[PDB]
Amino acid sequence: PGATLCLGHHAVPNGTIVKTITNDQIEVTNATELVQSSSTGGICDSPHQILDGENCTLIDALLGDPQCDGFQNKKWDLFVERSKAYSNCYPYDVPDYASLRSLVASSGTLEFNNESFNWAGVTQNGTSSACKRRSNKSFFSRLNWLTHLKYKYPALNVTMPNNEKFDKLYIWGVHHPVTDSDQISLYAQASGRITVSTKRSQQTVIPNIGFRPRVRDISSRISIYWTIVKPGDILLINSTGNLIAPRGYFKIRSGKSSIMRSDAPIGKCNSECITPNGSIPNDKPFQNVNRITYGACPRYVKQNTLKLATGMRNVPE
Amino acid sequence: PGATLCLGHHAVPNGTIVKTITNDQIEVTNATELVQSSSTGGICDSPHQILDGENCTLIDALLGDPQCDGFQNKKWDLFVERSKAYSNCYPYDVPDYASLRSLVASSGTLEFNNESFNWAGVTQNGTSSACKRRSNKSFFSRLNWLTHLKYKYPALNVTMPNNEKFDKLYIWGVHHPVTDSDQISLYAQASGRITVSTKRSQQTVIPNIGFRPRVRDISSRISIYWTIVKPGDILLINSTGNLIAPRGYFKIRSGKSSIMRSDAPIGKCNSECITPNGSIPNDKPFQNVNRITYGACPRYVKQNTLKLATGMRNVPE
Amino acid sequence: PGATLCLGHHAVPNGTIVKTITNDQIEVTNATELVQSSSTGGICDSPHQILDGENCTLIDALLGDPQCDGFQNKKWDLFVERSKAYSNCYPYDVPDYASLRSLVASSGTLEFNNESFNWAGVTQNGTSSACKRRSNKSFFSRLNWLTHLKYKYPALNVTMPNNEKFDKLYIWGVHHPVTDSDQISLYAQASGRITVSTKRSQQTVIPNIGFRPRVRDISSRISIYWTIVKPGDILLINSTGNLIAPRGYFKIRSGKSSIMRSDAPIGKCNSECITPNGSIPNDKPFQNVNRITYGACPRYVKQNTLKLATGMRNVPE
Ligand SMILES: *[C@@H]1O[C@H](CO)[C@@H](O[C@@H]2O[C@H](CO)[C@@H](O[C@@H]3O[C@H](CO[C@H]4O[C@H](CO)[C@@H](O)[C@H](O)[C@@H]4O)[C@@H](O)[C@H](O[C@H]4O[C@H](CO)[C@@H](O)[C@H](O)[C@@H]4O)[C@@H]3O)[C@H](O)[C@H]2NC(C)=O)[C@H](O)[C@H]1NC(C)=O
Ligand SMILES: *[C@@H]1O[C@H](CO)[C@@H](O[C@@H]2O[C@H](CO)[C@@H](O[C@@H]3O[C@H](CO[C@H]4O[C@H](CO)[C@@H](O)[C@H](O)[C@@H]4O)[C@@H](O)[C@H](O[C@H]4O[C@H](CO)[C@@H](O)[C@H](O)[C@@H]4O)[C@@H]3O)[C@H](O)[C@H]2NC(C)=O)[C@H](O)[C@H]1NC(C)=O
Ligand SMILES: *[C@@H]1O[C@H](CO)[C@@H](O[C@@H]2O[C@H](CO)[C@@H](O[C@@H]3O[C@H](CO[C@H]4O[C@H](CO)[C@@H](O)[C@H](O)[C@@H]4O)[C@@H](O)[C@H](O[C@H]4O[C@H](CO)[C@@H](O)[C@H](O)[C@@H]4O)[C@@H]3O)[C@H](O)[C@H]2NC(C)=O)[C@H](O)[C@H]1NC(C)=O
Ligand SMILES: *[C@@H]1O[C@H](CO)[C@@H](O[C@@H]2O[C@H](CO)[C@@H](O[C@@H]3O[C@H](CO)[C@@H](O)[C@H](O)[C@@H]3O)[C@H](O)[C@H]2NC(C)=O)[C@H](O)[C@H]1NC(C)=O
Ligand SMILES: *[C@@H]1O[C@H](CO)[C@@H](O[C@@H]2O[C@H](CO)[C@@H](O[C@@H]3O[C@H](CO)[C@@H](O)[C@H](O)[C@@H]3O)[C@H](O)[C@H]2NC(C)=O)[C@H](O)[C@H]1NC(C)=O
Ligand SMILES: *[C@@H]1O[C@H](CO)[C@@H](O[C@@H]2O[C@H](CO)[C@@H](O[C@@H]3O[C@H](CO)[C@@H](O)[C@H](O)[C@@H]3O)[C@H](O)[C@H]2NC(C)=O)[C@H](O)[C@H]1NC(C)=O
Ligand SMILES: *[C@@H]1O[C@H](CO)[C@@H](O[C@@H]2O[C@H](CO)[C@@H](O[C@@H]3O[C@H](CO)[C@@H](O)[C@H](O)[C@@H]3O)[C@H](O)[C@H]2NC(C)=O)[C@H](O)[C@H]1NC(C)=O
Ligand SMILES: *[C@@H]1O[C@H](CO)[C@@H](O[C@@H]2O[C@H](CO)[C@@H](O[C@@H]3O[C@H](CO)[C@@H](O)[C@H](O)[C@@H]3O)[C@H](O)[C@H]2NC(C)=O)[C@H](O)[C@H]1NC(C)=O
Ligand SMILES: *[C@@H]1O[C@H](CO)[C@@H](O[C@@H]2O[C@H](CO)[C@@H](O[C@@H]3O[C@H](CO)[C@@H](O)[C@H](O)[C@@H]3O)[C@H](O)[C@H]2NC(C)=O)[C@H](O)[C@H]1NC(C)=O
Ligand SMILES: *[C@@H]1O[C@H](CO)[C@@H](O[C@@H]2O[C@H](CO)[C@@H](O)[C@H](O)[C@H]2NC(C)=O)[C@H](O)[C@H]1NC(C)=O
Ligand SMILES: *[C@@H]1O[C@H](CO)[C@@H](O[C@@H]2O[C@H](CO)[C@@H](O)[C@H](O)[C@H]2NC(C)=O)[C@H](O)[C@H]1NC(C)=O
Ligand SMILES: *[C@@H]1O[C@H](CO)[C@@H](O[C@@H]2O[C@H](CO)[C@@H](O)[C@H](O)[C@H]2NC(C)=O)[C@H](O)[C@H]1NC(C)=O
Ligand SMILES: *[C@@H]1O[C@H](CO)[C@@H](O)[C@H](O)[C@H]1NC(C)=O
Ligand SMILES: *[C@@H]1O[C@H](CO)[C@@H](O)[C@H](O)[C@H]1NC(C)=O
Ligand SMILES: *[C@@H]1O[C@H](CO)[C@@H](O)[C@H](O)[C@H]1NC(C)=O
Ligand SMILES: *[C@@H]1O[C@H](CO)[C@@H](O)[C@H](O)[C@H]1NC(C)=O
Ligand SMILES: *[C@@H]1O[C@H](CO)[C@@H](O)[C@H](O)[C@H]1NC(C)=O
Ligand SMILES: *[C@@H]1O[C@H](CO)[C@@H](O)[C@H](O)[C@H]1NC(C)=O
């Protein structure tokens, strides 16, 4: 009689369909998903330092809009900007806004140091009803609106050396009055011109008098500029009117900081990978949640699912 | 005696040489080409909506050059710009020309709506011998050259609200006269200044009087600018001279539209993939016709040919 | 008794560890390194034409700084800029500096042709103590500082046609005086304005009078601009003061030329691939020396080492 000895392999009743080089649909005993397609819906507050902008854009927190005083000197790994954020100060624009936003986001700090600028012969600390704190007329916290003193505005020619070991970021502005009579009532002369320079750079800006549409009841504008001053260099401000003066400088650092637009709530939890949709697990190599990511994240791909076989071909009985 | 039974495989007299991981030249029984290397030489007019610019650049058709009146309100999937195209109106430049061209190309429409701007106290509809229609002096169809009325040009301070559900694109310009006497004869005052603003943006432009080389016998210039006005925002134009005024707005859409430089003829045929060389079949995954493509196109690669084996190794008798 | 016949394969005592799809560490009999991780430390002077900038930036050699007279009309495949390089002429800036540097680097030539500009009614060849040659006051070699003649500066309205078969690059500038009295003592009128145009382009620049920090004892500045003039086009310079005039044009070529920042010494040797660290062998497909490369170079990758098996699995006795 003898015996029979059969060689074989396992199978399962419930196999999984995968793709190969030669077949778009072949059943294997087991597979694992390589694309992360879901988020928790919230941004975990750990392990990255998250700063929720709430009502404030980064630039409003920089300039010191009345709703953003809580942000002074704060640092972040990720600044989260909300779609509802709105400005509540004097109407302004920033030529190159995207660049200033980027460079501050990347620096990751609003650390500010006051400096004693000698604004000889002018009135300091100008305020406006378009920028209230506690119903008092106010202004951007980090800027100094200079105006005439006893109907004179003598030329400014003011220096601030950088004797630090680090770079300084200066934010400053030019005021564009609505009319020629406004120009005279504020600055006591028919126009201005502002030149801000260092040993290696120069910027001159001309105020442009005229009407813009009313925003928070103001038809004038402020235009915001910035200047970086290296160790051993010197800031020189030379102006005859219309200067929205710096009060000091911001520290500028380098590191891993960034900014993200999201309306996702911040939660008490721990996740390395942040998207605008919320944090996502990062076990998988790929994800199709969002191209926008921050941290140790799977790579964004177009596919919904990619199944990696983890077993043999399934050949059921 | 018994029998002999031989196992074997086919071969062909005429095999094809392919590349593998271990051999740059191995003969197989059959192969297929994966790189499309030829075009028909013409651009098929289907299934994309093709607009042949003929003598007109997109920007000339936008502004309304005399040779481009046939283009009014036309739409396209692909605007085809010809190398022979030339301007036949007042000499102009567009700071950022590439961006205006891109944004209009991408929008895919020249749909224009006239609006009633109140140009109180000036002469409208200025014309020039450098921009003829039917030998009559004329001007860009979408722009309004304003000049003095009875040797006065009172300040303009004109508003146009956007109460639509869509964005409006405004095209406007500044006239740079050749001389101080030209400035006075056109605008009745020594210079101009133009500020165009919205609630969220502002542009001011200064005319610059002086000689440029003659183009179509004109040594002055026009510089072209644009402004996008969102729903609920308001256009404000404030100027004292030198304004080349808008007559209305263009619709701005988003979609699949673009622009291509080509001298290929347009034919009555159907092809999904367009290159400057002409339409190409899109059965193959790769092509080496042109990096510039539009539609469902193979991907551009450097290789002339890539042969995919579709049979076994060929081992002839 | 009979015989025994055993089939087998070789092995070595000293195998090499490689990575595969299924194992990060498997021993093979032999392998070869695919990542170049070392340089010689010097830049080989062959086979590319190397131009060592020594104390000169490319832009200083272009303008004709006193330390850069040896560079006149030189050509390069690779211009090497040293970190110690410094300027020793009148303090200047170049709006778009990076672009002018790039376009000259890419052109690969400082070939300069003088032209006879008719500067009727002004003093030519102005010099300064901030730009010495042999202790004599001097100026940038390729620029012409125009000033008043007998306390007059009549308007300039000067033409230079391009009747060549090639494009011309013109470099020119605007002088920004420190004070209103300086403006008058140099140019005999209260301000300037410079318009440089062609048939297809226009640039106007306004001088901006004021103090900048002293650099080589000068608080004024020069701002440098450029203009390309095509065959058949015409350069037109129209100015009333503050013009730092061109003396001629540079040739502009296209080809394989570039620029690199490096402090590596130049040696007498032959290597196709240049990095800032020095030349590297290019036998391997990859390298981790520097992302910055010039010539026939391996591709930059993050890995230190990638070992390609060149033998079987090593199974020692
Ligand atoms: C089909 O094939 C897949 C892939 O091989 C198998 O999935 C693995 O299953 C094993 C055994 O259950 C898993 O091992 C466990 O992993 C946990 C950590 O999870 C990591 O990866 C997952 C991915 O989903 C993430 O959730 C997470 O962030 C981690 O990165 C460990 O915590 C587990 O530990 C447990 O056992 C150990 C034994 O020492 C103890 O220390 C602990 O007490 C603990 O209880 C465990 O190691 C493995 O993660 C799975 N891999 C993947 C990729 O999912 C399936 O099991 C297989 N299915 C079938 C039916 O055969
Ligand atoms: C060497 O190997 C290649 C690849 O396997 C073989 O090429 C295939 O040959 C078959 C049979 O001739 C082709 O099948 C036919 O395809 C036509 C559609 O063409 C598509 O792909 C080509 C690519 O060149 C494009 O021109 C075109 O845009 C399409 O995307 C069909 O129209 C044909 O239909 C005919 O038969 C069917 C049968 O039902 C009928 O419905 C119709 O009446 C009609 O007459 C047909 O299906 C196939 O396209 C080829 N593939 C490729 C990639 O070229 C070679 O045959 C082989 N050579 C040898 C000697 O063995
Ligand atoms: C482990 O596996 C590797 C890869 O197979 C083997 O390395 C090869 O070894 C052979 C024989 O020594 C080498 O052949 C020689 O190449 C020289 C040119 O070098 C090129 O590549 C190297 C890469 O390091 C560069 O240095 C160089 O820039 C070149 O691009 C030739 O000059 C040699 O010529 C000599 O022999 C010929 C015979 O005709 C004569 O003409 C000359 O007189 C001359 O003396 C020779 O051809 C080959 O380059 C190596 N390849 C690589 C990638 O390194 C190892 O040998 C093997 N190790 C073991 C223990 O088996
Ligand atoms: C130049 O044109 C602009 C735009 O048309 C004019 O601005 C408008 O000025 C009026 C009058 O001051 C403003 O009216 C005010 O509206 C507020 C808000 O409702 C109200 O509280 C005030 O009592 C007053 O009615 C109007 O808001 C403003 N419009 C815009 C769009 O800014 C400007 O007056 C013109 N200048 C001249 C000199 O004519
Ligand atoms: C750059 O800073 C300097 C230094 O303050 C400014 O120059 C100074 O400007 C003032 C006011 O414009 C000048 O005073 C005026 O002089 C005229 C001439 O007699 C007189 O009529 C006026 O009543 C007034 O006194 C002053 O002379 C001048 N100083 C120098 C050294 O030139 C300059 O304005 C600043 N630039 C900018 C853009 O702000
Ligand atoms: C400032 O310089 C420019 C450039 O040299 C001068 O422009 C030139 O002006 C002359 C005289 O009007 C133009 O001549 C005309 O040429 C046309 C075409 O052949 C002809 O039909 C007319 O009868 C006349 O001869 C010339 O085209 C023009 N050149 C350029 C390059 O634009 C300008 O006159 C100078 N301004 C002053 C105030 O000197
Ligand atoms: C922005 O729009 C406003 C409103 O039209 C413009 O302001 C107005 O400009 C005119 C002409 O410059 C001023 O009239 C002039 O007043 C002087 C002073 O007495 C007089 O000598 C002249 O004969 C003439 O009548 C008008 O007062 C002024 N209105 C206001 C409210 O300031 C302004 O020019 C526009 N800006 C631009 C850049 O166009
Ligand atoms: C406007 O402000 C600037 C910046 O504070 C003033 O520039 C400074 O001017 C002084 C006086 O000319 C310069 O002093 C000189 O220093 C050199 C080098 O040590 C020395 O050789 C001279 O004998 C003299 O002491 C100083 O360098 C310069 N500072 C800077 C940073 O540029 C300018 O004077 C002010 N203008 C007015 C009208 O007040
Ligand atoms: C562009 O080039 C033209 C041609 O040279 C310049 O125009 C000319 O400018 C001069 C000086 O500004 C004018 O002469 C002046 O005329 C007035 C008016 O009577 C007189 O008071 C002065 O004493 C002087 O003679 C000349 O008339 C004028 N020519 C023309 C045809 O307008 C213009 O300045 C140049 N533009 C630039 C930005 O440099
Ligand atoms: C995460 O957020 C993104 C961005 O909003 C979502 O992608 C959008 O999905 C909508 C449909 O819900 C589409 O209309 C848009 O085209 C998508 N936007 C972009 C920018 O691609 C995405 O669905 C979200 N994913 C998850 C898993 O929540
Ligand atoms: C399609 O058009 C392109 C662009 O003109 C052709 O590519 C050029 O070919 C010429 C030689 O005829 C070269 O001198 C240029 O360097 C190429 N230009 C570019 C931008 O790469 C191409 O040959 C055409 N292809 C076909 C199949 O017609
Ligand atoms: C070649 O030069 C590069 C650039 O300086 C070197 O890369 C730097 O290495 C230092 C450490 O020595 C790091 O701190 C920097 O982050 C690196 N710089 C950049 C820009 O990546 C590199 O080490 C040199 N390689 C060799 C083989 O000499
Ligand atoms: C943000 O603004 C809204 C009103 O727009 C207000 O209800 C809310 O209290 C503000 N949040 C903070 C944190 O100030
Ligand atoms: C301006 O305000 C600050 C407080 O913000 C104060 O320290 C300073 O004395 C004020 N200066 C003047 C001139 O009013
Ligand atoms: C285009 O211009 C040429 C002359 O340059 C003319 O022959 C042709 O008729 C024009 N085409 C159209 C469509 O107007
Ligand atoms: C300007 O021209 C248009 C026709 O293009 C006409 O409707 C309008 O009445 C003209 N306006 C004036 C003020 O001449
Ligand atoms: C470069 O400058 C240094 C001083 O800064 C000098 O020692 C050296 O001789 C200069 N080199 C050349 C080539 O002129
Ligand atoms: C300017 O200098 C050059 C030499 O660099 C000389 O040829 C020319 O004659 C000088 N011109 C004047 C007007 O001084």
Numbering used by the authors:
A (entry chain A), B (entry chain A), C (entry chain A): 9 to 325
Paper text:
Since entering the human population in 1968, H3N2 influenza A virus has evolved extensively, especially in its hemagglutinin (HA), due to selection pressure from the human immune system. The HA glycoprotein on the viral surface is responsible for cell entry and is the main focus of the humoral immune response. The HA RBS is a shallow pocket on the apex of the HA1 globular head, and is formed from four structural elements: the 130-loop, 150-loop, 190-helix, and 220-loop, named after their location on the HA primary sequence. The HA RBS engages host receptor sialylated glycans and consequently is relatively conserved in sequence compared to the rest of HA1.
We further examined the structural basis for the loss of E190D reversibility in recent H3 strains by determining HA structures of HK68 E190D, Wy03, Wy03 D190E, and Mich14. In the panel of the eight strains tested, Bris07 was the earliest strain that lost the E190D reversibility and Wy03 was the latest strain that retained the E190D reversibility. We then compared these structures with HK68 by aligning the receptor-binding subdomain (HA1 residues 117–265). A slight shift was observed for the 190-helix of the RBS in those H3 strains isolated after year 2003 (Fin04, HK05, Vic11, and Mich14), but not Wy03. This finding coincides with the aforementioned notion that the reversibility of E190D was lost during early to mid-2000s. The Cα190-OH98 distances in HK68 WT (Glu190), HK68 E190D, Wy03 WT (Asp190), and Wy03 D190E are around 9.0–9.7 Å, whereas this distance in Fin04, HK05, Vic11, and Mich14 is around 8.5–8.8 Å. The Cα186–Cα228 distance in HK68 and Wy03 is around 4.5 to 4.9 Å, whereas in Fin04, HK05, Vic11, and Mich14, it is around 4.2 to 4.5 Å. HK68 has a Ser at residue 186 and Wy03 has a Val, whereas Fin04, HK05, Vic11, and Mich14 have a Gly. The presence of a side chain at residue 186 may increase the Cα186–Cα228 distance, as well as the Cα190–OH98 distance, and reposition the 190-helix further from the 220-loop. This notion is consistent with the fact that G186V can restore E190D reversibility.
